[PDB]
């Protein structure tokens with residue numbers, strides 16, 4: 093099912109149909125602040141961001157990039173950096189060659205190149221720089237910055253149809269056309285297929301699915317997939333997952349970014365967490381152990397069940413750094429915590445290891461299952477720490493080198 | 494695209510292809526606690542739960558249901574109640590007819606009916622009760638409680654194939670077969686097509702999509718769709734949305750429930766919120782105004798942007814009760830809050846009303862767009878309260894009766 097694509101290396105990270113779908117993010121510190129940006133790149137990388145983007149918006153930002161890269165390399169952090177260019181990318185890349193060389197990838201937006209004839213020249217200049225330095229490029233369209241000349245073109249084509257489409261449908265058409273035309277122009281200039289990634293983001297899920305299906309049909313490039321401007325909190329999380337899932341299940345998408353608005357004081361790493369959860373939920377990557385647990389209902393005996401589930405989740409997170417170093421494959425661990433006999437044994441048998449608490453009407457004992465069979469039955473006090481010891485014993489055996 | 498189905502009324506709430514996809518939830522208080530359960534049914538309903546399920550697990554639970562229903566009706570709360578039966582449903586429904594009459598729907602699990610021959614008799618008894626009272630039924634299979642006799646049957650059929658499938662694939666087959674056979678048996682007994690809903694839940698997203706596609710092909714019934722045992726926190730939210738979205742976009746699903754494990758002390762209403770967000774993200778329902786906002790990046794000028802986005806989201810939530818009463822259609826409101834000129838004007842033009850803050854390099858002014866055109870430009874202090882006044886003025890005009 094995975095769409096075949098050429099491989100594009102973003103630094104040491106390969107993107108494309110033969111490679112795992114890469115998680116990426118973008119900093120939100122001012123790029124001119126070397127200390128703050130370096131720190132956030134590191135933080136994002138440590139959280140799971142395999143590629144990190146930073147805006148390169150003005151001369152002060154450009155001047156900071158080589159120093160950011162130097163500091164990352166000094167700690168052996170080889171996380172690739174993507175520069176995000178708008179309006180003046182051709183000028184910054186021309187004027188600051190050390191910045192152009194320090195970056196691992198350039199992002200161009202076909203709607204933020206300039207006016208009229210200037211747009212093609214600016215484009216060309218950026219692509220020439222990339223070719224000269226052997227850098228990959230993302231041609232990233234976004235409907236928040238759609239090339240107006242292209243929109244008018246397609247509106248006029250639409251108006252000629254026997255059955256014109258809606259204005260909204262035409263905007264989607266223009267967005268795809270913008271990406272596809274810029275992709276083909278870059279190819280025609282001599283930028284290699286191993287150096288082009290495409291995106292074309294919109295902020296509504298159903299629209300994103302239409303767009304990406306069209307991009308995937310009309311191009312061969314690896315695709316950077318994300319729902320732009322997803323918003324805040326649960327809404328932003330849900331919309332992001334709902335938009336990406338249909339496309340990922342159809343084999344479309346080579347790298348993802350989750351565009352969450354942080355709440356004031358919420359860490360910028362949250363979007364990385366959500367990206368990882370999307371991929372893992374769909375079986376496309378394994379990053380860390382996970383917990384399958386029922387909602388609980390009036391059959392569940394006390395607040396113990398919710399406490400135990402949370403304690404297990406916490407413990408897995410705490411053990412992971414050590415486990416990752418010792419036990420190959422542990423990222424695939426699935427642990428169940430269940431509230432009663434209705435689904436508890438059966439769901440637990442589908443995990444690597446699971447506990448079925450006794451709910452209402454049951455004898456006060458908790459069977460524990462591993463590899464689909466009864467392992468033991470726990471009773472009394474301290475069931476949580478007993479179970480967590482059995483999980484540790486399980487991991488040490490199952491994921492032994 | 495919506496799959497056509499007969500209409501099944503769950504109380505006053507119609508379920509099926511001609512009706513909006515209904516949000517449902519399940520209580521987690523002990524059903525025997527009348528006060529606690531009534532209160533939680535009300536809370537869930539007020540949060541958006543159009544249908545509420547409660548376990549009816551033992552005689553004490555059964556005895557409480559008529560009193561719960563009576564209390565709800567005394568306040569004019571017509572929220573339909575679904576009784577969740579396992580193991581002893583035939584006995585409780587027989588012994589407590591006032592409970593059977595008080596419920597609006599019975600849920601049966603074909604894997605929790607009993608042993609051997611007893612399973613068909615128990616089934617039949619429950620279906621007979623439902624027919625006698627004119628109640629609808631959900632036949633709800635779950636792979637945590639899969640009928641073992643059916644699994645063996647299908648394992649033996651599998652073993653005879655020239656190319657047997659995996660054990661995991663056979664479990665999925667058995668789950669679908671369990672639901673389909675019980676559905677057909679209920680039809681054959683004389684339960685009407687206007688009285689049968691089906692589910693067949695699994696805890697892994699990709700599996701849920703396979704299962705529901707099969708259920709949808711093989712049956713005509715409205716389908717209750719949910720990812721069972723989704724787990725806690727962001728993982729549970731993401732997995733739920735990722736599993737449901739592909740199916741909802743294909744037109745499959747007539748009611749949903751989100752199976753989140755609450756954190757200790759987290760309200761049971763969170764699953765309702767997530768369910769609403771799934772449906773609204775996909776354009777299938779509109780419950781309340783929403784905010785489209787960028788992630789912010791190093792182009793964004795201060796923590797003001799995140800604060801403003803959050804303030805707008807909060808204000809919309811606070812205004813909604815009044816707005817819903819005054820202004821028809823307001824649930825469809827889309828408001829944008831954007832961090833800079835790159836995408837700010839364009840995204841704002843796609844909302845009903847939006848603000849584009851000035852980011853780095855820009856003059857300290859914030860254009861505001863409404864209905865796709867410039868409405869005003871804000872400057873100075875108090876931009877948040879000015880914008881929120883313009884949102885109020887907008888709503889009063891656009892959503893006027």
Ligand SMILES: C[C@@]1(CO)OP(=O)(O)OP(=O)(O)OC[C@H]1O
Nearest residue numbers: 232234293319320321349351836
């Ligand atoms: C930074 C921007 C600029 O176009 O990048 P995109 O890749 O278009 O989209 P997203 O990742 O949602 O980030 C916000 C955008 O403003």
Ligand SMILES: C[C@@]1(CO)OP(=O)(O)OP(=O)(O)OC[C@H]1O
Nearest residue numbers: 435633635694720721722750752
């Ligand atoms: C209550 C149970 C019982 O089978 O209901 P289902 O509808 O099978 O699934 P879900 O809504 O995930 O709730 C948990 C289950 O244990």
Ligand code: SF4
Nearest residue numbers: 386388389431432434
């Ligand atoms: S497994 Fe038991 S306690 Fe958990 S939600 Fe299902 S019926 Fe309730």
Ligand code: SF4
Nearest residue numbers: 787789790832833835
């Ligand atoms: S709209 Fe501007 S501030 Fe917001 S993420 Fe995009 S480039 Fe950054």
